[PDB]
Structures are given as C-alpha cells and as structure tokens.
A paper describes a structure:
Clathrin-mediated endocytosis is essential for protein retrieval during neurotransmission and receptor recycling. Accumulation of the adapter proteins at the plasma membrane initiates the endocytic event and contributes to membrane bending. Complex formation has been observed between the ENTH domain of epsin and the ANTH domain of Sla2, the yeast homolog of human huntingtin interacting protein 1 related (Hip1R). Epsin and the phospholipid PIP2 are essential for clathrin-mediated endocytosis, and we show how assemblies are formed between the ENTH domain of epsin and the ANTH domain of Sla2 in fungi.
As a further indication that the ENTH2 dimer, which sandwiched PIP2, is functionally relevant, a similar dimer interface is observed in a crystal structure of the epsin Ent1 ENTH domain (ENTH1) from S. cerevisiae at 2.9 Å resolution. Here, a 2-methyl-2,4-pentanediol (MPD) molecule from the crystallization solution has caused a displacement of the α0 helix to allow dimer formation between ENTH1 domains. Native MS on a Thr104Glu mutant of ENTH1 from S. cerevisiae shows a reduction of PIP2 binding, where the binding of two PIP2 molecules is barely observed, indicating impairment of the binding site.
Residue numbers in the entry:
A (entry chain A), B (entry chain C): 1 to 147
The structure:
C-alpha cells in the first residue's frame, strides 16, 4: 500500500493540527533540544488565538509525562521559557493558573537507565524556570528589552 | 436502573468501537494471555483500512501504560508479533516509525508489591520482538511461507 505519509497518518488518527505537531516536534524524544527557529515560530503562534490554546495544552500534556520521558519534560520547559520571554502575555498568565504543575516538577526522579541521573536536568530547569516566574520585576523588564 | 449491560456503557463513554474493544479485551490485565482466535481476527481486520488504524493506536496507547499494568504491555507486544508475522504489511511499517516506543521497552522496571519482577517478561519479549523486527531478511521469508 501507500508509504511515506505514514508519519503524518499517525497525527491525523489523534487529530493533531500542524501547530500541535510543531509542538510535538519541538518536544521530540531524541536529545537535540529545541531548534532556534521553531521557538520564535511558536512565539508568533502564541498571539494566534487558536494556535495559542493548542500550544499551551500540549505543553501541559508534555509536562505531566512519565519518568521515562525526561526529554519531553526537558524540552517542554525550554519552550515554556521562550514564550514567557518572547511570546504573548497570554503565555505568562497561563502558567500562573496551573503553577502547581511546575512546582511539582522540582522533584523528578529517574535514575533507572541504568543508574545515570537523567532526571536532574528536568529538576534543575524547572527550579530555574519557576524562579524566573514567581518574581514580577525580572519578567516585565526582559519582555520590554525583547520586543 | 439497568444491570449487566452497563459494562458496554463504560466502553461507550470513551467511544470505543468493536475493534478498539477487541484489542482491550485480548490485551486485558489477566495473565491468561491473548486467544489464538483473537489473533487471526485482528490479523484479518488489519487488512481493513478502517480498523487497521484503530489497532495500531490502541496497541500504542497500551505500550506506554504504567508500571502497575505489566500484563497489558506484554500482550500488546505479543500481539504486534502476530501482525508483523501474519497480518498486513501496513502494520510492519507502522512499527518502524514508532520504534522509539519499542526500543525503550527493552528495559522496564516493576518491583512487584509481593516482592517479584516481571518486569522482565515485558523487557524480554521487547528484546525478542525488535530483534525479529530489525531484520529485513527474516521478515520477508516469514510472511511468504505463512501466506
């Protein structure tokens, strides 16, 4: 039967739009962090009312991932970082609502494959992130010096 | 209000089709493993392009199950074995893309409440399956002599 579309056949089954996929691509399961361009492109779609909502929800679905998928949670936090600094005000306030999800990720355990502390990058980045969040002074200044 | 038929409602509320239900029943949380009949049924329905997609996703939605459901992950693997061995070629190529889910299952931790680990049953069938999967020569010979 047909062949190379099968990658995109998957996303259709679950009903992911290209915006949901670009987030799913940005938070991939490999190691390469997030591409420099993908972030500003998600920064643009953060203003787009429809896309915006698709983005936020996908990160929350990515933040509450298993112990095994440390990289989803690793990349997700860098994405959430780029939006609160470059994207819309909508982005910051969203995080403030479900702030407990980030505070919980401070303590993430995954030293199982096969002993290496892989889940520290998750802990540290979250702690590093929410530190930037809770303060009001350092937020508004960074945004003014970006746009 | 009603009695035994309420079971079907549970599968209704989540919007499960006949095939989506047959997958969940064969790949249930019992230790009896799948039925030989249920295998060739899902192998046959694998040819049907409508059912074909439901199966893969329901097998995928069951491979990333929690620690507690070790029996789901085991049967799901042994199911994919039958389809890569008997069913439509479409199935095999599906697996080649979501190989990241298969590769990671080589290791899997499950301390078993009573004090055991199976645990390995999940680990081992994965290792044994992908080893069969990765080879191009073993596949093409296996199917031609079965059809």
């Amino acid at each position: 039967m047909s062949k190379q579309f099968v990658r995109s056949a998957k996303n259709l089954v679950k009903g992911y739009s290209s915006t949901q996929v670009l987030v799913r691509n940005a938070t991939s399961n490999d190691n390469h962090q997030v591409s420099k361009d993908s972030l500003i492109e998600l920064a643009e779609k953060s203003y787009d009312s429809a896309d915006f909502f698709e983005i936020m929800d996908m990160l929350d679905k990515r933040l509450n991932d298993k112990g095994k998928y440390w990289r989803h949670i690793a990349k997700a936090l860098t994405v959430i970082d780029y939006l609160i600094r470059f994207g819309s005000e909508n982005c910051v306030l969203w995080c403030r609502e479900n702030l407990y999800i980030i505070k919980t990720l401070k303590e993430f355990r995954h030293e199982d494959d096969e002993g290496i502390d892989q889940g520290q990058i998750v802990r540290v980045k979250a702690k590093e992130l929410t530190a930037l969040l809770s303060d009001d002074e350092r937020l508004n200044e960074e945004r003014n010096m970006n746009i």
